[PDB]
Each structure stands twice: as C-alpha cells, then as structure tokens.
Amino acid sequence: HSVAVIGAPFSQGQKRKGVEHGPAAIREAGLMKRLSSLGCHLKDFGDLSFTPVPKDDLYNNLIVNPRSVGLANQELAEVVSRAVSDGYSCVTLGGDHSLAIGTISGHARHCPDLCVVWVDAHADINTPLTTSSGNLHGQPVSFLLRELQDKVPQLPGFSWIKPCISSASIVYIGLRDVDPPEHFILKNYDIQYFSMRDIDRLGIQKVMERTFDLLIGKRQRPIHLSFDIDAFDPTLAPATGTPVVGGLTYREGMYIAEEIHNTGLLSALDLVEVNPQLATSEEEAKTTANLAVDVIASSFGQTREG
Amino acid sequence: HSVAVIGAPFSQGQKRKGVEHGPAAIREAGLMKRLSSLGCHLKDFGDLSFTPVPKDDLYNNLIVNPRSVGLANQELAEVVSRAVSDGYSCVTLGGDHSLAIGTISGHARHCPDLCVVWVDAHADINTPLTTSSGNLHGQPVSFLLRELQDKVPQLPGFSWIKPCISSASIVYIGLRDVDPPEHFILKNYDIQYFSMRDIDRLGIQKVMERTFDLLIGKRQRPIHLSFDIDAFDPTLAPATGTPVVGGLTYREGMYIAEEIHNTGLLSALDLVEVNPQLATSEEEAKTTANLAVDVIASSFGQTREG
Amino acid sequence: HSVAVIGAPFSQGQKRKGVEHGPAAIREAGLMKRLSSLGCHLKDFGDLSFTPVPKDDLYNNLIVNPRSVGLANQELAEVVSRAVSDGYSCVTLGGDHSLAIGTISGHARHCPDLCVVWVDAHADINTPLTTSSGNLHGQPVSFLLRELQDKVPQLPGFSWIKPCISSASIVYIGLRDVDPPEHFILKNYDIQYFSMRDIDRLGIQKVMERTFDLLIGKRQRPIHLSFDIDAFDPTLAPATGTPVVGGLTYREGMYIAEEIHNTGLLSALDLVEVNPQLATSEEEAKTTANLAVDVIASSFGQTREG
Ligand SMILES: N[C@@]1(C(=O)O)CN(C[C@@H]2CCCCN2)C[C@@H]1CCC[B-](O)(O)O
Ligand SMILES: N[C@@]1(C(=O)O)CN(C[C@@H]2CCCCN2)C[C@@H]1CCC[B-](O)(O)O
Ligand SMILES: N[C@@]1(C(=O)O)CN(C[C@@H]2CCCCN2)C[C@@H]1CCC[B-](O)(O)O
Ligand SMILES: [Mn+2]
Ligand SMILES: [Mn+2]
Ligand SMILES: [Mn+2]
Ligand SMILES: [Mn+2]
Ligand SMILES: [Mn+2]
Ligand SMILES: [Mn+2]
C-alpha cells in the first residue's frame, strides 16, 4: 500500500503564530519511520510553499487572510488530487484546519462518493456570516457541504471552490465547544455528530459502529479522516491553538484510528492544529507531536496487540 | 428562571484552615457571568456572616464547634427557606459540608417532599456516636434522616433541627472512602448509593438513570444537589481538605450535572469543600475553582454541544 | 486468613538498576499495616538473599544472567512452596518479572491445578529464540507453559523447571506492547488475552467476567495473580522500567484486584517491576509504591465502599 505525506505549513486560517511548524514537529517525532515499519510505501512531497497574496485585506472587515487561504487551498487541492490519482492514500500534516478545504476538494475531485469523519472539539462549520472570530479554520465545513451553499457568500480567492459533499456524508466525533449558530446549522441540516456527551453515554465502540453505519452501511466509500489534535484532552495535546477541557482519552483516540484502519477504506487523512510554539515546555511540544504520530500510525494499521 | 447565590464561608465543620475562602474563589472564577449567560436571573445574597457562639466547648470531649455549626446552619436555613419561597433556585457556595444541614433544612421547610442527590467521595453519615474525627462535616446526613433519629443524640445548638427526609429520599454518587459504621448505616437503612465501583460497572449514564428512577420514578420532586468537590479525582480538584484517589473524571462530573439539569427539577445546589489554601500552587487553586463553576453552570443548563 | 510476604529483590532479569529496591519501597508505603487491618495474619519472610553464580556468561551471546536468574528462581520457588504448603496466600514483591518463574513454579509445586491471571502491558512470552532484548523478565511465561516446551531450549540453571501449566490456564489483561513473535505464539497456541483495546470495547467488568469464565467457569481453582505495575498508565505508575502509554486507569486496576478477591480463590500474588530509581522525583517514587500497596490490599479485600 502507498501513502503520500504532504506538509502543509499554513497558519493564516487563524491568528496564533506557530502552527505552520506542525509538519516539521510531526516529522521530527518519527512519522516516516513509523509508516515505513507498517509496510507503507512512502512518497514524501516535502512541505509545500504556498504562493502569498499581496495586500490580502480583511473581507467584510472581519474575515482574515481570505485570498491567502483560498489560494493555498487551491494549490494544496491540486497536490492532493494528483497524489490520489497516482494511487496514494494522502496524509496531510498541518497547519491550521482551514487546509481541509483543500484536502477534501482535491480528494473529492477523484473520489466524489467520499465520506468524511471529522474528529474535533469543534464543528468548524461557521459561515462567513456566522463566524464571530473571523478565522477561516472555524469555517471550512461550511464551504464543503452542498446543502449550505445558498447561505455561504463568495469570498475573494474562493471562486474555484465547489462544494462536493452532502451533509449526510460527514460525521463528527468529539464535539464540546460549538457556537450557537453552528449548533443551529447541525440541527437544521440534520448533520450527525457524537459529542463528548454521546461518547460518555455510548462508549467509543458504539460511536464508531454507528458512525460507519451512517456512512458506509449501504455501500463502500473512500473515507476522509480529518483529525484535529484538539479533539484530545488538553492534558494529552497541550500544544494547540484552542484547547478545550474534557476531550478524548489516549485510548479513545487510538480506538477511533484503529476502527478507521479496520474499514480498509481510508483514502486521505488530515492531522491538523499541532502548534509546538504554544507548548510551555519542550516536553509538552514533543508529547503532542508524538500523539499526532500515534494517530496517523494507528490509522494505517499500528495495533495495540502487535 | 431565577437563581439565588449564597456564600456560606464556614470552616468550623472541620479543622483545616481556608475552606471559608471557597465562596470567594468560586466567585472569582467567573460564576456570576456564567450563570447570567445561560439566562439565569440572579440575586446575590453575598457572603453571609454567621453569629459566633462564645465558649463553644467540645461536645462529649469529641465533637468540635457544635453550637457554632448549629447556629450558623440555623441562620443559613432561614436564608435558604426565604429564597426558595421567593421562587429562587438556591446555589450555596461553601465552606465545609456541614452547611448542608442548614441548606437542606431550609429547603425542606416548605418542600418536605424534596429528594437529595449527594455527590461525594464520602457518605458524611457518621452520627455523633460513630464519628472518629469529631468533625461535623462528616456527620451532616445523620441529622437529616428521619429513620436515624433514635440513634442521634441532641447536640448543643441543634435543637431547632427536625429531620424531614426519609432514607429512601437520598442517593449517593461517587463513594470511595467510607467508615465501617457508615457502611453499616447505609446497609441497615437500605440507603441507595453508587460507589466508584458501581460507576466502573454501570457507566455514569445508567447511574443517573437509576438515580432518578429511585427518586422521581413515581412523582416529580424538587431536587437538592449537594456536590462535594472531592467527588472529583484529586488530579482535577486538588484544593480540598480530604482528597481520595480514584474519583470522578471531568466528563463524569459534567454528565451528572447535565442530567440534573435535564430533569427540570433542580431547586437547590450546594458546592462545598473548595479550600484554596490547600492548593500547592495558584494554578491548582484556580483549576479547582474553575471546576466548581463548570459544575454549577452545567447544573443550570450549560451543555457540551451548544 | 493467612498471608506470607516475600521480598524478591531481583534485577538480573533485565538491565536497568534499581528494581531490586521495589520490595523495600513497597514495604515503606505501608503494606503490612494495610494487610493486617484487613484481618490478614501475617508472616514476613523479609527480603531473600539469592546465591550468586560465578562467571554467569551470556547464553548464546544474547541471554543475560541465565544461571543467576535460574538459581534465584529455584531458591524463590522453594520459599514459595513451603509458604503455600503451610497455609499462606503468598505475596511476592519484585524485583523484575523473571521472578514469576520462581513464584509460579513454587506455587504449582503445591497447587498443580492453579490458573494464572497476568496483568501487564507486555506478554512476557518471548522464548530464548524469539527475544530481541535477551532480558529474561520478557520471557518468563515461555518457561512455564507445557505446550511451548519443544520450542524452548534448555538454559544453564533452568533444568530444575518442570513446566506443566497449560496454555489454557493463563489469561492476560492489559496488553499493549507485544512483539510480533509473541503475537504469533499467543495466536498459535490459542492463549486468551484482553488487550487495552478489548478493555476499551468490553469494559473491565465484562473483561473480568470472561476471564473467570475461561479459568474457573468449569471448576474452582487456586488463582495466581501476577501483576506487573506497568499495566497501569505511566501517569499513575511512572517508576518502572518499560512504561507504555495508554494503560489501566487507577479504577480499572482496583476493579481487577477487587474481582480477584471476590472469587475467594486468590492463592498467590506477584507485584513486580516497581523501580524507584527511575522516578524523576520522590513524589513519583512514592505514588508508584502506594499504587502497588493499593493493588495488593484490594486483592485481599480492601473495597471502595467500606
Ligand atoms: N468556533 C470557533 C471559531 O473561531 O469559529 C470559536 N472558538 C471556540 C471558542 C468558543 C467559545 C469560547 C471562545 N471561542 C474556536 C472555534 C474555531 C476552532 C477551529 B479549529 O480547527 O481548532 O477547530
Ligand atoms: N468519614 C470522615 C469523617 O470525618 O467522618 C473521616 N475522613 C475519611 C478518612 C477515612 C480513612 C482514614 C482517614 N479519614 C473524612 C470523612 C469526612 C469527610 C467530610 B466531607 O464533607 O469532605 O465529605
Ligand atoms: N518484549 C520485551 C522484551 O524485552 O522481551 C521488549 N520490551 C519493550 C519493547 C520496546 C520497544 C519495541 C517493542 N517493545 C519490553 C518487553 C519485556 C517486558 C518485561 B516486563 O516484565 O516489564 O513485562
Ligand atoms: Mn478543527
Ligand atoms: Mn478544533
Ligand atoms: Mn462531603
Ligand atoms: Mn467528601
Ligand atoms: Mn510489563
Ligand atoms: Mn511483566
């Protein structure tokens, strides 16, 4: 099996410095050797250098770096599309979660029936009209869902984007910090999610069983796993931009990834929002990067029983 | 929906200095803004000043500060009774857990059919004849339960207390540090409880289901939630006087509070035993205070999915 | 009603210094008083001094200290056999896990129909032909299981060992760091195990139920509990030689011990691999030793509900 690794050192989906160093931190934590050890044939695309945009002024005096985020995601989408074309499962290292616009667009280009597992403390589904931060890393899903497009105005640099996913084709796992307009969107478009509360009730084994019944119970589909490291409790993943108490345990995160691998359908994976600069110690930065590597490795077959 | 907040800075139910600063620490952690944000209309009664009793000698050369605990609880009960009659759900901030004598007596004064959910590492059900510490914060339930009163002698300053509640009307959640005479009492009077072991077996969802079926399965009753911060594992709630390893997780504490809110019946809440002076660091004190606010907020409707 | 305590301060099953101070550390954390309070009549054999072997060269240029480990276990087996013969449940404090060769051989010498519950992050079932470390604490099970013996060469100092326990008579709980040859052995011999993943799926209550169904579902048998402290998550048991992320919680460990007690069949217990020199602080050392005392005390009747 063949896996392409793409560093996407992007930070302009939000305002905190340092998430552009996530890809190097994850690499420094041993990613490539771990993937090789599993039998993965590897193509390293390196870290992309995204084309800047001069005078990328706020959109509507709120939305930050719109043209830079639109253009970086267009370029990323091109690399993901071509790698998925050439037979690779695509691992994209971030970088902030606005990059999911690019990886899911590029993925869907060649696999239009793909489904999405979004593992995250946050829903990332604000629109340009509901965001209260202006940060695109909290809006990427709104640009991707067919059913929402009449409520998403067109941003400078975003005209290449055509939503390719139905709201029935994404499931969230781990929600615990949702804005009211996001909650409204989830309920109003009947988007399925398992919050931390649902995990407390069902247990992660049932959560995964129901996730796959919703997504692939009728038919096999390529799976896009978009994993925000802040889905994990901050005690485990402290080096990240928007930590929220009461997250996944280590064991729960491994279990999610093991179940992803067990479908045999994993086609692309994002590992986003590792920001080593927000660690208060080198150890905090390395434990976060090591946890990122554990997620990716388990998603491609690393087991706890050997 | 109206919420009264009462500071009860009492420490004479036990011997460790500093729990009288519990109410200020909780207020400082942002309680009042959190309750407003949920839509609660608030009346802050401030921090009560309890009348001292001169020459409050030990009772039976063992029980410490009996008259002061008795009189402070008499005064607290009056405030609680008044706030309930004016339509407020009553939040009392402690302070050591002997204040539940006052809040439950005042609550039961005009709601004699109330039920009690007692969240705690301890049963607090020693009598003056079984306590080996002499600390009234470890005896409050013995004064409240009608079936026990033939076995509870009359302490100086306690004559105003009339046990209003049946032993079928209290459920414990989180027990893990129980004296042999307390275990006898729980068994002998058939008092229902879910120890940490029961949570390990059943899961917190079923624990709450069985709690409400036992208490409100046949009729709606105002709920008194007496929440001792030491129900949480000491890694989460270190700033407290009697910590015991193996406690509730954060998620379990939130889930309890969420289910309390979901009944619609919460009528009074005690948040006791936060002692900021027992934290070894400012960060330990503040995480303990912040956890207290999360419990209260979740008990009045804060959710994890927005 | 009677418990023997044997200190086995052995370190030559592995290469890290200090695990020979496990027994003293566990005793200093209050083991004997805790056992007495449960009503255990106690015989303390102290710490054994094992006979050295001159010129104990590597076996096959790989296996370290073979004769010293063999002889020390022969001597330990003799002490365990006598204690079990005289009516004592035998508690052996390690020391590295190669001592289970001695404690299980000595136990079986008096109770041949014993069964084994092996709580560990590791399977410890490498043979001299599969070990990649050469450390005998990672091989003890291979010397004990009847079905494996054609694949186990005879080591100098090991000829006294009579391996008559069946592979159907051991169950593992907690596995998460298993070598590929150990995985092959476990599958090829149909040895039953509950990995951390199984615990994630089933919950520790069902794990224990199924463990006892496999071992004592048809008849009562004396139970040998061999408990490697590194089964627990490293955050709870840091002072140990091979820590592995994602282990048992405190509550899961207590629950295992409680169910061991509840069978009424506990006949011997090993508490191994506490190495206080690997703690980065005195706090980490004492937390690990206190956890070891909790495991042993719970295995002999300490409950969380009193
Ligand atoms: N919804 C947000 C947005 O900016 O839209 C607001 N903020 C959450 C929090 C909610 C209430 C307290 C103040 N802020 C983060 C989130 C983006 C997460 C992006 B990611 O990729 O890490 O998930
Ligand atoms: N049972 C106690 C009492 O004093 O009666 C004794 N002590 C428990 C513990 C038992 C093991 C040996 C050391 N002591 C705490 C408890 C009071 C807790 C009051 B609270 O409001 O925090 O719950
Ligand atoms: N299988 C081992 C052996 O030495 O045989 C290899 N080693 C850990 C090794 C490190 C990284 C690669 C995979 N695992 C520990 C185990 C022995 C544990 C003995 B015990 O009593 O602590 O359980
Ligand atoms: Mn995200
Ligand atoms: Mn997030
Ligand atoms: Mn209490
Ligand atoms: Mn308590
Ligand atoms: Mn081990
Ligand atoms: Mn071991």
XYZ file of N, CA and C in Angstrom, chain C residues 81-256:
528
model
N 6.927 -22.503 47.802
C 6.304 -23.808 48.000
C 6.056 -24.081 49.479
N 7.042 -23.774 50.330
C 6.872 -24.005 51.758
C 5.756 -23.141 52.320
N 5.743 -21.860 51.960
C 4.726 -20.959 52.483
C 3.321 -21.397 52.052
N 3.152 -21.737 50.776
C 1.845 -22.203 50.321
C 1.486 -23.520 51.002
N 2.474 -24.406 51.187
C 2.216 -25.673 51.864
C 1.752 -25.461 53.299
N 2.204 -24.388 53.949
C 1.853 -24.145 55.341
C 0.573 -23.332 55.507
N -0.208 -23.135 54.439
C -1.492 -22.461 54.537
C -1.526 -20.986 54.169
N -0.414 -20.399 53.740
C -0.394 -18.974 53.421
C -0.717 -18.707 51.956
N -1.552 -17.700 51.721
C -1.525 -16.993 50.447
C -0.216 -16.224 50.370
N 0.461 -16.339 49.237
C 1.819 -15.857 49.104
C 1.875 -14.568 48.287
N 2.354 -13.487 48.910
C 2.577 -12.220 48.222
C 4.075 -12.073 47.991
N 4.493 -11.972 46.737
C 5.903 -11.782 46.426
C 6.113 -10.402 45.813
N 7.009 -9.625 46.409
C 7.309 -8.270 45.960
C 8.575 -8.281 45.105
N 8.470 -7.767 43.868
C 9.629 -7.665 42.999
C 10.319 -6.298 43.109
N 11.475 -6.162 42.439
C 12.082 -7.203 41.619
C 11.489 -7.240 40.218
N 12.249 -7.716 39.229
C 11.759 -7.769 37.858
C 10.914 -9.026 37.640
N 10.188 -9.057 36.520
C 9.157 -10.075 36.341
C 9.705 -11.477 36.094
N 11.027 -11.666 35.965
C 11.539 -13.026 35.825
C 11.313 -13.843 37.097
N 11.029 -13.183 38.223
C 10.735 -13.897 39.457
C 9.453 -14.717 39.379
N 8.559 -14.412 38.438
C 7.356 -15.224 38.288
C 7.677 -16.658 37.869
N 8.841 -16.898 37.256
C 9.291 -18.275 37.052
C 9.342 -19.002 38.383
N 9.955 -18.368 39.386
C 10.061 -18.986 40.700
C 8.738 -19.045 41.448
N 7.968 -17.949 41.444
C 6.755 -17.959 42.265
C 5.697 -18.888 41.695
N 5.578 -18.954 40.373
C 4.583 -19.847 39.792
C 5.036 -21.299 39.866
N 6.323 -21.572 39.627
C 6.817 -22.937 39.814
C 6.612 -23.390 41.256
N 6.933 -22.527 42.222
C 6.778 -22.911 43.621
C 5.320 -23.072 44.024
N 4.465 -22.161 43.558
C 3.023 -22.286 43.746
C 2.502 -23.586 43.144
N 2.848 -23.856 41.882
C 2.353 -25.070 41.235
C 2.852 -26.323 41.946
N 4.026 -26.241 42.574
C 4.588 -27.394 43.262
C 3.652 -27.881 44.362
N 2.865 -26.984 44.957
C 1.877 -27.406 45.938
C 0.444 -27.395 45.425
N 0.141 -26.609 44.391
C -1.216 -26.460 43.867
C -1.168 -26.632 42.349
N -1.032 -27.871 41.870
C -0.802 -28.091 40.424
C -1.957 -27.684 39.512
N -3.191 -27.583 40.004
C -4.287 -27.142 39.143
C -4.496 -25.617 39.189
N -3.468 -24.848 39.552
C -3.619 -23.395 39.597
C -3.868 -22.818 38.199
N -4.440 -21.620 38.177
C -4.562 -20.849 36.951
C -3.941 -19.484 37.208
N -3.659 -18.750 36.130
C -2.823 -17.558 36.204
C -3.538 -16.383 35.546
N -3.613 -15.265 36.259
C -4.084 -14.009 35.689
C -2.875 -13.085 35.621
N -2.509 -12.671 34.397
C -1.255 -11.964 34.128
C -1.590 -10.543 33.680
N -1.379 -9.575 34.567
C -1.787 -8.191 34.339
C -0.537 -7.400 33.997
N -0.506 -6.843 32.797
C 0.775 -6.442 32.250
C 0.508 -5.695 30.957
N 1.357 -4.696 30.666
C 1.357 -4.115 29.325
C 2.000 -5.055 28.315
N 2.727 -6.063 28.799
C 3.522 -6.955 27.972
C 3.099 -8.402 28.183
N 3.352 -9.227 27.158
C 3.019 -10.641 27.233
C 4.111 -11.469 27.898
N 5.359 -10.996 27.921
C 6.420 -11.693 28.657
C 6.544 -13.162 28.224
N 6.322 -13.427 26.933
C 6.212 -14.811 26.466
C 7.196 -15.069 25.328
N 8.135 -14.150 25.117
C 9.257 -14.487 24.251
C 9.941 -15.737 24.779
N 10.484 -16.522 23.865
C 11.372 -17.621 24.199
C 12.815 -17.196 23.982
N 13.782 -18.021 24.397
C 15.190 -17.710 24.091
C 15.485 -17.587 22.607
N 14.630 -18.115 21.734
C 14.821 -17.994 20.294
C 14.087 -16.807 19.680
N 13.182 -16.154 20.405
C 12.493 -15.005 19.829
C 12.856 -13.681 20.493
N 13.397 -13.707 21.709
C 13.726 -12.464 22.395
C 14.693 -11.634 21.561
N 14.420 -10.336 21.472
C 15.347 -9.437 20.807
C 16.133 -8.597 21.792
N 15.800 -8.689 23.073
C 16.482 -7.963 24.131
C 17.451 -8.835 24.904
N 17.188 -10.143 24.996
C 17.966 -11.015 25.851
C 17.597 -10.965 27.323
N 16.593 -10.180 27.703
C 16.243 -10.000 29.107
C 15.195 -11.029 29.498
N 15.501 -11.812 30.533
C 14.622 -12.898 30.938
C 13.303 -12.422 31.544
N 13.200 -11.162 32.022
C 11.892 -10.697 32.510
C 10.866 -10.589 31.390
N 11.308 -10.634 30.138
C 10.436 -10.637 28.985
C 10.172 -12.023 28.442
N 10.623 -13.060 29.133
C 10.411 -14.427 28.688
C 9.773 -15.375 29.707
N 9.374 -14.944 30.918
C 9.120 -15.962 31.956
C 8.018 -16.936 31.584
N 6.987 -16.475 30.874
C 5.859 -17.353 30.578
C 6.290 -18.502 29.684
N 7.289 -18.280 28.829
C 7.687 -19.341 27.909
C 8.234 -20.554 28.654
N 8.780 -20.350 29.845
C 9.357 -21.455 30.599
C 8.313 -22.245 31.362
N 7.078 -21.742 31.427
C 6.051 -22.286 32.297
C 4.966 -23.038 31.551
N 4.789 -22.771 30.262
C 3.657 -23.288 29.512
C 4.047 -24.603 28.849
N 3.309 -25.667 29.205
C 3.554 -27.022 28.712
C 3.648 -27.075 27.187
N 2.683 -26.465 26.488
C 2.595 -26.619 25.037
C 3.766 -25.989 24.294
N 4.530 -25.106 24.931
C 5.583 -24.388 24.224
C 6.929 -25.090 24.277
N 7.038 -26.210 24.992
C 8.351 -26.590 25.513
C 9.268 -27.134 24.431
N 8.707 -27.707 23.362
C 9.524 -28.138 22.230
C 10.187 -26.968 21.513
N 9.720 -25.742 21.744
C 10.293 -24.559 21.119
C 11.170 -23.774 22.084
N 11.437 -24.325 23.262
C 12.160 -23.591 24.289
C 13.427 -24.372 24.604
N 14.596 -23.891 24.185
C 15.841 -24.587 24.526
C 16.079 -24.549 26.027
N 16.944 -25.445 26.492
C 17.268 -25.522 27.913
C 18.426 -24.583 28.229
N 18.209 -23.695 29.126
C 19.212 -22.724 29.522
C 19.992 -23.233 30.732
N 21.253 -22.825 30.872
C 22.003 -23.177 32.084
C 21.330 -22.590 33.316
N 21.114 -23.445 34.315
C 20.427 -23.078 35.532
C 18.928 -23.290 35.516
N 18.350 -23.717 34.386
C 16.905 -23.857 34.238
C 16.413 -25.301 34.274
N 17.314 -26.286 34.363
C 16.900 -27.683 34.224
C 15.945 -28.128 35.322
N 15.965 -27.475 36.487
C 15.031 -27.824 37.552
C 13.581 -27.508 37.206
N 13.320 -26.715 36.170
C 11.968 -26.211 35.939
C 11.111 -27.293 35.302
N 9.960 -27.573 35.908
C 9.035 -28.517 35.291
C 7.791 -27.785 34.790
N 7.741 -27.424 33.530
C 6.626 -26.614 33.019
C 5.364 -27.414 32.741
N 4.449 -27.520 33.706
C 3.255 -28.333 33.484
C 1.950 -27.526 33.430
N 1.999 -26.186 33.531
C 0.793 -25.375 33.359
C 0.396 -25.318 31.889
N -0.898 -25.440 31.621
C -1.385 -25.422 30.251
C -1.604 -23.997 29.756
N -1.481 -23.827 28.442
C -1.728 -22.533 27.824
C -3.178 -22.098 27.986
N -4.083 -23.033 28.276
C -5.469 -22.674 28.554
C -5.660 -22.167 29.971
N -4.610 -22.166 30.791
C -4.734 -21.797 32.195
C -4.151 -20.422 32.528
N -3.838 -19.599 31.526
C -3.364 -18.237 31.761
C -4.208 -17.284 30.923
N -4.609 -16.165 31.522
C -5.297 -15.091 30.812
C -4.533 -13.798 31.073
N -4.303 -13.028 30.021
C -3.636 -11.738 30.106
C -4.661 -10.621 30.137
N -4.372 -9.587 30.925
C -5.171 -8.367 30.933
C -4.228 -7.174 30.859
N -4.409 -6.335 29.834
C -3.763 -5.041 29.788
C -2.775 -4.848 28.656
N -2.686 -5.817 27.747
C -1.590 -5.864 26.791
C -1.631 -4.681 25.835
N -0.456 -4.122 25.540
C -0.397 -3.041 24.560
C 0.991 -2.863 23.942
N 1.966 -3.722 24.277
C 3.312 -3.614 23.674
C 3.844 -5.047 23.476
N 3.412 -5.676 22.386
C 3.610 -7.101 22.139
C 4.524 -7.255 20.927
N 5.595 -8.034 21.077
C 6.469 -8.317 19.947
C 5.754 -9.215 18.941
N 6.096 -9.106 17.658
C 5.455 -9.958 16.629
C 5.603 -11.444 16.927
N 6.782 -11.943 17.344
C 6.835 -13.376 17.714
C 5.971 -13.715 18.924
N 5.802 -12.787 19.867
C 4.874 -13.046 20.963
C 3.442 -13.100 20.457
N 3.082 -12.202 19.533
C 1.748 -12.266 18.959
C 1.520 -13.602 18.257
N 2.524 -14.090 17.527
C 2.388 -15.381 16.862
C 2.149 -16.487 17.882
N 2.942 -16.500 18.953
C 2.770 -17.507 19.994
C 1.362 -17.441 20.571
N 0.893 -16.235 20.897
C -0.420 -16.120 21.525
C -1.510 -16.682 20.615
N -1.444 -16.359 19.320
C -2.417 -16.882 18.363
C -2.224 -18.377 18.125
N -0.992 -18.803 17.836
C -0.745 -20.207 17.501
C -1.128 -21.158 18.635
N -1.046 -20.719 19.889
C -1.402 -21.597 20.999
C -2.764 -21.273 21.598
N -3.531 -20.387 20.963
C -4.868 -20.041 21.428
C -4.846 -19.555 22.885
N -3.840 -18.752 23.226
C -3.761 -18.168 24.563
C -4.662 -16.942 24.617
N -5.503 -16.861 25.645
C -6.518 -15.813 25.718
C -5.977 -14.548 26.392
N -6.318 -13.397 25.828
C -5.829 -12.145 26.373
C -6.863 -11.054 26.142
N -6.897 -10.104 27.056
C -7.680 -8.886 26.890
C -6.690 -7.728 26.793
N -6.478 -7.240 25.579
C -5.611 -6.096 25.389
C -6.326 -4.827 25.857
N -5.589 -3.704 25.896
C -6.230 -2.428 26.214
C -7.394 -2.148 25.273
N -7.271 -2.569 24.007
C -8.351 -2.420 23.035
C -9.587 -3.212 23.455
N -9.392 -4.453 23.919
C -10.516 -5.235 24.423
C -11.167 -4.545 25.613
N -10.356 -3.973 26.508
C -10.909 -3.242 27.649
C -11.676 -2.013 27.178
N -11.124 -1.278 26.206
C -11.862 -0.181 25.580
C -13.225 -0.626 25.066
N -13.284 -1.806 24.449
C -14.526 -2.288 23.858
C -15.467 -2.862 24.909
N -14.975 -3.767 25.749
C -15.862 -4.527 26.618
C -16.139 -3.840 27.945
N -15.190 -3.052 28.449
C -15.259 -2.570 29.809
C -14.657 -3.586 30.766
N -14.060 -3.117 31.860
C -13.321 -4.015 32.743
C -14.244 -5.000 33.480
N -15.536 -4.686 33.669
C -16.421 -5.660 34.317
C -16.586 -6.904 33.454
N -16.934 -6.727 32.175
C -17.031 -7.877 31.291
C -15.679 -8.560 31.097
N -14.579 -7.790 31.058
C -13.259 -8.414 30.940
C -13.033 -9.398 32.083
N -13.363 -8.988 33.317
C -13.157 -9.878 34.457
C -14.118 -11.063 34.406
N -15.381 -10.818 34.033
C -16.342 -11.913 33.928
C -15.840 -12.975 32.967
N -15.384 -12.556 31.790
C -14.900 -13.508 30.802
C -13.595 -14.155 31.233
N -12.743 -13.419 31.946
C -11.524 -14.020 32.470
C -11.844 -15.191 33.393
N -12.754 -14.989 34.349
C -13.075 -16.067 35.272
C -13.856 -17.180 34.590
N -14.688 -16.863 33.591
C -15.346 -17.946 32.870
C -14.324 -18.857 32.200
N -13.279 -18.289 31.587
C -12.261 -19.122 30.944
C -11.529 -20.003 31.954
N -11.182 -19.454 33.109
C -10.280 -20.157 34.009
C -11.012 -21.017 35.032
N -12.077 -20.501 35.647
C -12.757 -21.197 36.730
C -14.239 -21.406 36.416
N -14.620 -21.275 35.142
C -16.007 -21.491 34.762
C -16.475 -22.930 34.923
N -15.559 -23.898 34.823
C -15.917 -25.305 34.975
C -15.650 -25.854 36.371
N -14.609 -25.375 37.047
C -14.304 -25.832 38.393
C -13.563 -24.734 39.138
N -13.627 -24.805 40.467
C -12.817 -23.940 41.312
C -11.344 -24.307 41.188
N -10.487 -23.292 41.072
C -9.044 -23.492 41.003
C -8.334 -22.381 41.759
N -7.216 -22.691 42.401
C -6.442 -21.626 43.044
C -5.917 -20.665 41.985
N -5.951 -19.378 42.311
C -5.635 -18.326 41.356
C -4.284 -17.733 41.718
N -3.400 -17.636 40.717
C -2.132 -16.919 40.818
C -2.241 -15.601 40.055
N -2.160 -14.472 40.775
C -2.244 -13.145 40.158
C -0.834 -12.585 40.048
N -0.338 -12.450 38.815
C 0.992 -11.907 38.578
C 0.806 -10.512 38.004
N 1.078 -9.501 38.820
C 0.703 -8.135 38.489
C 1.965 -7.314 38.254
N 2.182 -6.945 36.993
C 3.257 -6.048 36.594
C 2.753 -4.620 36.761
N 3.442 -3.829 37.588
C 2.973 -2.473 37.851
C 2.836 -1.644 36.571
N 3.564 -1.988 35.493
C 3.490 -1.215 34.249
C 2.229 -1.494 33.434
N 1.334 -2.363 33.914
C -0.016 -2.419 33.358
C -0.713 -1.067 33.480
N -0.537 -0.402 34.616
C -1.086 0.929 34.840
C -0.461 1.940 33.885
N -1.249 2.942 33.516
C -0.734 4.051 32.720
C 0.500 4.682 33.369
N 1.498 5.081 32.579
C 2.695 5.732 33.149
C 2.420 6.959 34.015
N 1.330 7.693 33.774
C 0.991 8.807 34.660
C 0.708 8.336 36.078
N 0.249 7.099 36.242
C -0.025 6.565 37.573
C 1.117 5.734 38.136
N 1.862 5.025 37.298
C 2.985 4.206 37.754
C 4.230 4.571 36.954
N 4.811 5.752 37.211
C 5.990 6.162 36.432
C 7.262 5.412 36.791
N 7.391 4.905 38.019
C 8.663 4.352 38.487
C 8.757 2.872 38.111
N 9.050 2.632 36.835
C 9.089 1.279 36.289
C 9.892 1.300 34.992
N 10.454 0.139 34.636
C 11.478 0.095 33.600
C 11.014 0.225 32.157
N 9.832 -0.300 31.811
C 9.312 -0.254 30.441
C 7.897 0.319 30.442
N 7.746 1.618 30.696
C 6.400 2.212 30.693
C 5.844 2.351 29.281
N 4.524 2.178 29.152
C 3.851 2.253 27.853
C 2.575 3.084 28.000
N 2.441 4.143 27.189
C 1.254 4.994 27.247
C -0.006 4.175 26.993
N -1.118 4.650 27.545
C -2.418 4.071 27.266
C -2.802 2.886 28.129
N -2.427 2.894 29.414
C -2.634 1.764 30.290
C -3.903 1.839 31.126
N -3.983 0.917 32.081
C -5.110 0.861 33.002
C -5.242 2.165 33.778
N -6.484 2.606 33.983
C -6.717 3.651 34.965
C -6.563 3.069 36.369
N -6.453 3.964 37.357
C -6.476 3.555 38.756
C -7.714 2.717 39.060
N -8.879 3.163 38.583
C -10.120 2.474 38.918
C -10.178 1.095 38.269
N -9.692 0.974 37.036
C -9.665 -0.337 36.405
C -8.757 -1.291 37.174
N -7.582 -0.812 37.602
C -6.700 -1.650 38.402
C -7.349 -2.109 39.698
N -7.999 -1.184 40.423
C -8.708 -1.576 41.640
C -9.802 -2.578 41.317
N -10.496 -2.379 40.201
C -11.589 -3.276 39.884
C -11.072 -4.691 39.631
N -9.986 -4.824 38.862
C -9.372 -6.138 38.668
C -9.058 -6.787 40.012
